[PDB]
RNA sequence: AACAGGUGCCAGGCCAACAAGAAUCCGAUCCGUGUAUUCCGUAC
RNA sequence: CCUUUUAAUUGAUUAUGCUGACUUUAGUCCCGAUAAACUACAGUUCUGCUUAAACUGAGGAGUCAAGUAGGUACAAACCGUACAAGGAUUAAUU
RNA sequence: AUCAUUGUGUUAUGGUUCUAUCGCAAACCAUUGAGA
RNA sequence: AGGGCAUGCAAUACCAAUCAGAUAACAACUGAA
RNA sequence: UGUAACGGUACAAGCUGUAAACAAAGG
RNA sequence: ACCGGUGGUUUGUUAGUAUUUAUGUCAUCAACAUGUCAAUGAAAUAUCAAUAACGAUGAAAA
RNA sequence: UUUUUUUUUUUUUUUUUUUUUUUUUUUUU
RNA sequence: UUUUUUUUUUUUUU
């Protein structure tokens, strides 16, 4: 937002901030007078609203003169009540409450310094066509500043010159004006000119109009109209079952995560779940009898033989791992000789395993060593 | 069709003949669902 | 009264901007588990209460639609939505119990 | 739609103002309903809902035009329609209505 | 299948039978006309028979 | 085709059509045609709607945020 | 036709001099409007010929500013 | 990086937030860092130190650069134990944990702390390493409701019978009319 | 040539068009045609309780 | 049976005779490249 | 035919919950599944 | 690379050949019956045609087409428009 | 190697066809579960 | 498949001489599918 | 069974059927 | 050896592929309109900074 | 003021339409 | 070409 609506907004909240620490006697005695600060708005609006005919530069540099004197008495009045420092002034943190220590009277200052470089030629001008690079920063270096700040006197005025426009609409048609910032916000969405037409296509100059466009077109180009529906082009259907969709509400209270939101944990919840249905049923079953035959003749196995056996995996829709119509899996199907019945063969069976894992067990050593040694 | 000549002609849905084709988007043989 | 259909909204003219959006402010719909513990009456009272504010929101919306413009807080209708099913899950459940036992009877 | 029961319960009727660019009377408020409703079953929906004076209720059809997909850099040229079907429905209150809410206003 | 139907349990006529979940997890068979539970179905040990066709091939 | 659903005309309305096209919109009668154009309206086919008293309710559209909180310790305390 | 389907974009090929302005009718139809925000006392004119940031304030124009010297 | 086919899904994680990693391959090749965010739809993975390009502007007048994301498959797990590069393994213990298994070395690789690991508002596949000013404000440093906002108090009250209910949806349906007479 | 809606919708309309000794195998946009369209595909990772179906066969 | 076949081919065999070339590089030929390098390999494979 | 998918392009030893090298040299920018050499797993 | 094989239908200035692009003729031909004024101290420009009355106790004496063609910022866009009871007894309010 | 100069030679720009799969059984083989 | 699922495709054929229609008192009254 | 119309969704060659993108907690 | 569940091969690396609609006619009827769901890039979770110039990221850009 | 409905006059059915949803124990209040 | 409480039914007629 620019200065002319914050620096309003912030002196009417400081206002009440400072008008809520009266104690009665002092707050019935303002009840019937009021406050000046509580009213830079009318005032502001007034004054814009006062001169007739075009509005220059040097019109637009008296308003703000004319408000800056207003701050400047509403200060004073502020003051006049207190009168007092010797509690008060630690008591009620006058130092944050006063007009002028906020950051906005000095942009307003140097808003007036700017100007006070400006010569009479460009004084009595109405657009900000023919001012140049070269010219701005002419003025910029004059000024002792940068050249952000000149621009932003034009942009203003600019915008104080569509204000006027819409005032002069309003009061004619006798309806409404807004009262406030909000309500100005609020209003300036749907009912604001900002265009004239012209015959023989005609090009309209508007430097507020302008900076919109070029920020927009700054804004725009960076966007994608692939997921974007559009009329006579074919939509991709696999893509809408997984793409997540950031227009669905959210709600905490349910448990499971919505399907156009997270369909990856989505997903993982039902498998998650206990089995459901005669074929889960069924396959939990056959899952556990085996579980249940591996831990019984644990000796008999590998590790990873025994591990594999004990993953948890329920709902698994028909075929989930073929190659075709499936899942990515590594390890396929997968089987284990079960040992002999014969005692003479299932030592030598059992050892022949042990003899694996000593292997494997060796291998680990001898990494571990190196490492070890190798730590010099 | 003329009023004279639509008074004397029956409905296709009437007959079998509906029945008695493969016709189909995938070709000319088509498999009824549940077949 | 007629008033209703207006009053508290964005359309209502009789109040500034920050009460507009001090009452566009909104909580969670009604859940299953709550829902589930009131009796028919409660229910039945919940359900005009819903289309009320149903009706109320659709003027919004249109309003919106008429200006191009997106409609200000445009979950209140998803919540709303979700809350009249689920009132409607429940009696339905609340029935079928009653048939079940019916069958089971004449069997 | 649905076609509309003797007893109903949970009806499912959504009611909203529309805003016409046209000009109306001070007892005249301009309404969107579906196209499947009567004089007197929407004189019922206000009497007993809202509780609102009515006199006079005057419906009409509004059907929205046909439109063609011809401009931007890649037309289709495929007709389309904006909006829907419905019921323009015309309640004459007792009570005054402001303009602010059933007219349109433009700067 | 699509050559036979379930017959009504009163009725004895070929009708559609629904199934309902009850508030405790119950699960029951409705009729379509009758509107009544469907009876359970017979002891697999009773229609176990044996597959000669299966022997001679 | 110059007339008929080709150009997204649609199906055919009343609105579209010469006069004496009968089509509706969906209805329910209220009543019967006599033999001179007359028509006796009956209010015997008039739906009724039913609607509870509002006057004294405490319920409301939403739930306050801070329910959530409370229906959730209540959970851990059957732990 | 608005929907642009008939057979009336074969004259426009050619060129053409000149076209007909309802002027009388167009005028008539304006006055009208005039009339009607005349009545209850709003100036339409005025606002649609009014530079762009200027303000005048009822009947007033350059001439206004002739006698105002000061 | 762009959304993955779902056959392409990780059902279970190697990696974890704030894992030390090791880049196998890229631009930045031989660098190693610290997991910042992990990508479960995505197959992808941050690491600090690693692909930091973006740029963004402070209060201060400075500029600091954030990592992208890089394929999870080009990253590998280092064992503290020998501080060199090693393969993981999975093994389901009797009690239903999983743990992480070292090829080269064959230790344990217990899990990073998991009250450091930060979830996503709107979806949860998306984790984040939480910092120690965060954590903190929960440790110690720790929504008004609208007009239209059902009390607490009255939204819990419970008012349902069974044996109501029956009585009175019997009653309901038994005194029905057919008829209205009562309009006009 | 006339533009008759009347003669039109009586003698090649809907009702019309089925009394017709033709080859209705030809699909056609406003036409009840007969040709057969293979409907809803194969289900992929979905929730299982939501994939319709049938409805004819099964409504109750 | 035209000029552009002539084209193609005098392209294509600029190319063939080349070692590490890639996708981007090798373009519509990506294929034929392709096979005809791993034709090439199958001599290094021993029992 | 190790076309079984992916990883920046041609991967048995890298991601893919169960085997097997962050292997060495060469490389315009420029990652690089690529050339040369060599080890290992396999009832895949 | 070489060597063996290939049912590729494998070979082009031309069939007024089929499907497209782009030159020449070639800044050539084509332009519908009637306009003007809007100022520096008041006013009524000329011409063609001649059903232009909107409560008077009476629904303007009819049909058909427009698949909504006299609404809207010197807009081919967006947004609107069909009330058989005529809602404003709105002769009041401010 | 005839530009006398309205030509030719080289080079550059412009014009210029448009292919990223969302798929893959009812046949055969292997293995496994209950009951004869 | 927990729940729900407007309307149109002219339907007593899960049966029964033929010939219009919500499928026709005898006869008039007829026939290559 | 296969398809057409209307409505919703972000007015769309998708999804969906006024309960119009979900019930997952019955002691 | 029926019947349920899982995996692989062939058809098929050598063969191919269609569902929506603008336009013609009274009708029958005929018909392959308009690159892709798509700036580009492996990565946009790299499109920074701003006034001219020099500056940032990227193999390559204004 | 028309359309709707009887007659002329016609299942000579104007797809998604109707005084037309299973046809009077209707709780007359 | 039927006009105001709805049906069935007979003769004449500006």
């Not at chain 7, 006055?31 to 009014?50: E, I, M, P, S, Y």
């Not at chain 8, 007009?147 to 038994?174: C, F, H, N, S, W």
Request: aromatic letters at 10%; glycine letters at 6%; charged letters at 30%.
């Amino acid at each position: 937002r620019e200065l002319g609506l914050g620096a309003a907004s912030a002196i009417e909240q400081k206002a009440s901030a400072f008008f809520s620490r009266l104690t009665d006697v002092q707050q019935r005695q303002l009840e019937k007078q009021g406050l000046l600060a509580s009213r830079f708005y009318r005032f502001l609006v007034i004054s814009l609203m006062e001169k007739e005919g075009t509005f220059t530069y040097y019109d637009f540099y008296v308003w703000r003169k004319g408000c800056l004197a207003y701050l400047k008495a509403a200060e004073e009045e502020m003051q006049g009540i207190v009168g007092k420092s010797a509690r008060k002034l630690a008591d009620l943190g006058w130092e944050k409450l006063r007009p002028s220590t906020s950051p906005e009277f000095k942009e307003m200052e140097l808003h007036l310094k700017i100007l006070s470089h400006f010569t009479p030629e460009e004084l009595s001008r109405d657009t900000a066509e023919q001012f140049t690079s070269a010219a701005i920063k002419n003025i910029a270096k004059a000024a002792e500043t940068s050249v952000k700040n000149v621009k932003n006197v034009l942009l203003g005025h600019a915008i104080a010159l569509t204000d006027r426009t819409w005032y002069m609409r309003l009061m004619e048609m006798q309806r409404p004006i807004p009262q406030s910032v909000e309500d100005y916000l609020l209003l300036a969405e749907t009912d604001r000119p900002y265009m004239i037409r012209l015959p023989y296509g005609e090009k309209f100059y508007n430097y507020e109009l302008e900076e919109a466009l070029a920020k927009k077109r700054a804004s725009e180009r960076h966007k994608s109209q692939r997921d974007v529906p559009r009329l006579g082009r074919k939509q991709h259907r696999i893509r809408r079952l997984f793409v997540p969709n950031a227009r669905v509400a959210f709600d905490r209270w349910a448990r499971i995560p919505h399907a156009r939101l997270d369909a990856y944990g989505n997903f993982l919840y039902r498998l998650n779940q206990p089995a459901k249905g005669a074929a889960a049923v069924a396959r939990a079953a056959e899952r556990e009898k085996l579980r249940v035959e591996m831990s019984e003749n644990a000796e008999f196995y590998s590790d990873a033989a025994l591990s594999a056996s004990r993953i948890t995996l329920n709902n698994l829709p028909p075929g989930a791992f073929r190659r075709r119509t499936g899942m990515q899996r590594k390890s396929g199907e997968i089987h284990h000789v079960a040992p002999p019945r014969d005692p003479v063969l299932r030592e030598l069976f059992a050892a022949a395993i042990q003899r694996e894992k000593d292997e494997k067990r060796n291998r680990e050593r001898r990494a571990q060593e190196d490492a070890a040694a190798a730590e010099k | 069709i003329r009023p004279r000549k639509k008074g004397m002609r029956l409905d296709r849905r009437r007959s079998k003949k509906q029945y008695k084709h493969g016709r189909h988007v995938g070709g000319w043989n088509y498999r009824w669902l549940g077949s | 009264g007629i008033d209703e259909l207006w009053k508290g909204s964005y359309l209502d003219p009789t109040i500034g901007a920050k009460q507009k959006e001090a009452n566009a402010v909104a909580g969670d719909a009604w859940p299953a588990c709550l829902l589930r513990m009131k009796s028919f009456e409660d229910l039945h009272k919940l359900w005009y209460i819903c289309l009320k504010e149903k009706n109320l929101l659709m003027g919004e919306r249109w309003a919106a639609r008429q200006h191009k413009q997106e409609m200000k807080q445009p979950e209140r209708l998803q919540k709303v939505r979700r809350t009249m099913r689920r009132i409607l899950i429940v009696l339905t459940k609340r029935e079928i119990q009653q048939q079940c036992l019916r069958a089971k009877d004449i069997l | 739609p649905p076609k509309t029961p003797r007893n109903v319960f949970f009806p499912w009727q959504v009611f909203s103002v529309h805003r016409t660019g046209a000009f109306l009377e001070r007892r005249r408020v301009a309404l969107k309903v579906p196209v499947n409703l009567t004089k007197f079953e929407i004189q019922s929906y206000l009497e007993k809902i809202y509780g609102a004076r009515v006199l006079k209720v005057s419906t009409l059809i509004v059907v929205p035009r046909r439109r063609r997909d011809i401009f931007g850099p890649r037309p289709s040229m495929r007709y389309y329609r904006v909006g829907c079907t419905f019921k323009k429905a015309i309640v004459t209150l007792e009570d005054g209505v402001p303009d602010a809410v059933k007219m349109l206003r433009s700067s | 299948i699509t050559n036979v139907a379930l017959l009504d349990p009163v009725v004895k006529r070929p009708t559609r039978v629904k199934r309902r979940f009850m508030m405790n997890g119950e699960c029951v068979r409705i009729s379509k006309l009758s509107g009544s539970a469907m009876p359970e179905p017979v002891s697999t040990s009773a229609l176990r028979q044996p597959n000669l066709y299966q022997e001679y091939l | 085709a110059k007339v008929g659903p080709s150009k997204g005309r649609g199906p055919l309305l009343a609105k579209f059509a010469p006069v004496g096209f009968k089509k509706g919109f969906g209805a329910i009668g209220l009543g019967r045609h006599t033999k001179k154009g007359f028509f006796i309206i009956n209010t015997m086919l008039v739906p009724m709607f039913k609607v509870p008293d509002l006057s004294n309710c405490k319920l409301k559209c939403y739930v306050a945020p801070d329910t959530y909180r409370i229906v959730q310790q209540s959970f851990n305390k059957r732990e | 036709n608005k929907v642009r389907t008939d057979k009336k974009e074969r004259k426009r090929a050619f060129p053409q001099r000149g076209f007909w302005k309802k002027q009388n009718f167009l005028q008539v139809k304006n006055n009208t409007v005039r009339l009607a925000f005349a009545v209850q006392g709003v100036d339409l004119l005025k606002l649609k010929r009014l530079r762009w940031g200027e303000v005048r304030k009822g009947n007033t124009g350059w001439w206004t500013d002739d006698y105002r010297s000061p | 990086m762009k959304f993955v086919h779902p056959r392409h899904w990780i059902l279970q994680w190697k990696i974890r937030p704030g894992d030390k990693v090791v880049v196998i391959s890229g631009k930045f090749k031989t660098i190693r860092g610290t997991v910042l965010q992990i990508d479960k739809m995505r197959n992808g993975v941050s690491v600090s130190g690693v692909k930091e390009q973006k740029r963004v502007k402070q209060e201060d007048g400075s500029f600091i650069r954030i990592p992208g994301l890089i394929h999870v498959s080009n990253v590998m797990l280092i064992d503290q134990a020998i501080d060199l590069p090693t393969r993981v393994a999975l093994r389901v213990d009797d009690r239903g944990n999983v743990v992480r298994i070292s090829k080269k070395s064959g230790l344990v690789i217990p899990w990073p702390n998991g009250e450091m690991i930060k979830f996503g508002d709107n979806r949860k596949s998306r984790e984040f390493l939480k910092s120690k000013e965060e954590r903190d404000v929960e440790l110690r440093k720790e929504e008004r409701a609208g007009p239209k906002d059902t009390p607490a108090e009255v939204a819990v009250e419970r008012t349902y019978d069974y044996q109501r209910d029956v009585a009175t949806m019997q009653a309901l349906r038994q005194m029905m009319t057919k008829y209205n007479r009562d309009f006009r | 040539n006339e533009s008759s809606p009347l003669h039109m919708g009586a003698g090649s309309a809907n009702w019309t068009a089925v009394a017709r000794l033709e080859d209705f195998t030809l699909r056609g946009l406003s036409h009840p045609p007969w040709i057969h369209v293979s409907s809803r595909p194969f289900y992929g990772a979905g929730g299982g309780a939501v994939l319709a179906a049938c409805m004819s066969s099964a409504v109750w | 049976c035209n000029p552009q076949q002539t084209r193609r081919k005098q392209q294509y065999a600029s190319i063939i005779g080349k070692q590490g070339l890639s996708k981007k590089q090798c373009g519509i030929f990506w294929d034929y490249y392709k096979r005809k390098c791993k034709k090439r390999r199958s001599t290094k494979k021993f029992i």
